[PDB]
């Protein structure tokens, strides 16, 4: 397979526009990667992470996105909070794995790297795995927007302010979720 195209990959998608890839019919070695000790988080819910590589599956879904360290606890099976309710929601029955590593040196940028966007407003929560397609403006306050983002009517969240000199709670992390 091309896990290196996922792990040794160049660009990562922002959480509002996470990246899904289907994977099947290829050769993968799992304990080399989970034990590569290159990631800050590699937590598997459902399947045992410990060498439960005795399988070959019909399909593999890979969802990639960007968060901050402080925010990792909200990116988890059956987790509650801003991102899940308003930005990207995962169902409680997540039979998969989540990997994430600090990519400050790779996702920061001088003057700040403002490439990652997040959805900050939504009327509802995300019905298992959708992405930033429609990015309109919604009245999130009293009356019609009719145009220019303004009073009681906005977009989603801004950029992440991933300056390279940030604290870790404020640092960029790349996340890849395998189902």
């Amino acid at each position, epitope marked *: 397979c091309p896990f290196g195209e996922v792990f040794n990959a160049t660009r990562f998608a922002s959480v509002y526009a996470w990246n899904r890839k289907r994977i099947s019919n290829c050769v993968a070695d799992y304990s080399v990667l989970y034990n590569s000790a290159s990631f800050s988080t590699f937590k598997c819910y459902g399947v045992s992470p410990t060498k439960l590589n005795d399988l070959c599956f019909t399909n593999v879904y890979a969802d990639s996105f960007v968060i901050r360290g402080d925010e990792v606890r909200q990116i988890a099976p059956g987790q509650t909070g801003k991102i899940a309710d308003y930005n990207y929601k995962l169902p409680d029955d997540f039979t998969g794995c989540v990997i994430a590593w600090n990519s400050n040196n790779l996702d920061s940028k001088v003057g700040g790297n403002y490439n990652y966007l997040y959805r900050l*407003f939504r009327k509802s929560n995300l019905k298992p795995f959708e992405r930033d397609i429609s990015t309109e403006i919604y009245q*999130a*306050g*009293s009356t019609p927007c009719n145009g*220019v*983002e*303004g*009073f*009681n009517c906005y977009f989603p969240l*801004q950029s992440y302010g991933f300056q390279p000199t940030n604290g870790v709670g404020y640092q960029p992390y790349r996340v890849v979720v395998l189902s």
Partner: antibody, heavy 132, light 111 residues
Framework: EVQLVESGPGLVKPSETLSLTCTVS??????????WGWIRQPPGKGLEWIGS???????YYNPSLKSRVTISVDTSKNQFSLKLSSVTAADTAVYYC????????????????????????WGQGTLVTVSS | QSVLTQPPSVSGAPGQRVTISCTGT?????????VHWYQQLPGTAPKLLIY???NRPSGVPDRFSGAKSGTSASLAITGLQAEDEADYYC???????????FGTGTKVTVL
């Protein structure tokens, strides 16, 4: 960490337009939802809201005073200017400019209350006297 | 009407509880947009003291509390301390004037 500074002439003739400056630092008036406002305070009296701008060029003036109030911004210098037309000795007062960080208190209703309650950083203030 | 209405002064001796009332209308204190309180040393820049009816910015003693009901609100400072010698104003947005309207304000002296 936010700084505002009002500058201007102490004596502005009645029935004219006064332009006062308010250089700031620590934030950009280009920041999403940020505001810059003007408020007046007559001798020993209460505060009076005058106006606010927006990095989107949206702006608000006291409805009763809209036609006589004018606010302008200069993102490049991070400054807010307050212009007052048809001034009168009645308009004599202490002028304050103030910074509004993004929208309202975003936490709590999701800022779903127009503007929470108010702003954050106040300037030192400038005393303006109107007389002919 | 255009001013929130407060009793023009409220006083007490050091250690007393001093409360300040604040009378508004349907459009501000009543059906309006929540009440904030400011603490401000006379002639000096005010400082937000209470936000969103009942939030405190960090630094305001827990002994300052706010309450609202109908078109009237009050702030209670329960155990006046030397730091409490200031002016105090209430404020709230009025939908009828579409303006943020201040209270008439109170100066404290620790007797």
């Amino acid at each position: 960490e936010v700084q505002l500074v009002e500058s201007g002439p102490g004596l502005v003739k009645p029935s004219e337009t006064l332009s006062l400056t308010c250089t700031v630092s620590g934030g950009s008036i280009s920041s999403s939802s940020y505001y810059w406002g003007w408020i007046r305070q007559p001798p020993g009296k209460g505060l009076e809201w005058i106006g606010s701008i927006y990095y989107r060029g949206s702006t608000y003036y006291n409805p009763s005073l809209k036609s006589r109030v004018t606010i302008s911004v200069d993102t490049s210098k991070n400054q807010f200017s307050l212009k007052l037309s048809s001034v009168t000795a009645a308009d004599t007062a202490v002028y304050y400019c103030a910074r509004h960080v993004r929208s309202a208190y975003y936490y709590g209703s999701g800022s779903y209350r127009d503007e929470g309650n108010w702003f954050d950083p106040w300037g030192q203030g400038t005393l303006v006297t109107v007389s002919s | 009407q255009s001013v929130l209405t407060q009793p023009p002064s409220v006083s007490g001796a050091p250690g007393q509880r001093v409360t300040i009332s604040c009378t508004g209308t349907r459009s501000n204190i009543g059906a309006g947009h929540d009440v904030h309180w400011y603490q401000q040393l006379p002639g000096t820049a005010p400082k937000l003291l209470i936000y969103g009816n009942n939030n405190r910015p960090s630094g305001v003693p827990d002994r300052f509390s706010g309450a609202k009901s109908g078109t009237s609100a009050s702030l209670a400072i329960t155990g006046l301390q030397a730091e409490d010698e200031a002016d105090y104003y209430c404020q709230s947005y009025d939908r009828t004037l579409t303006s943020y309207v201040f209270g008439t304000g109170t100066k404290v002296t620790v007797l």
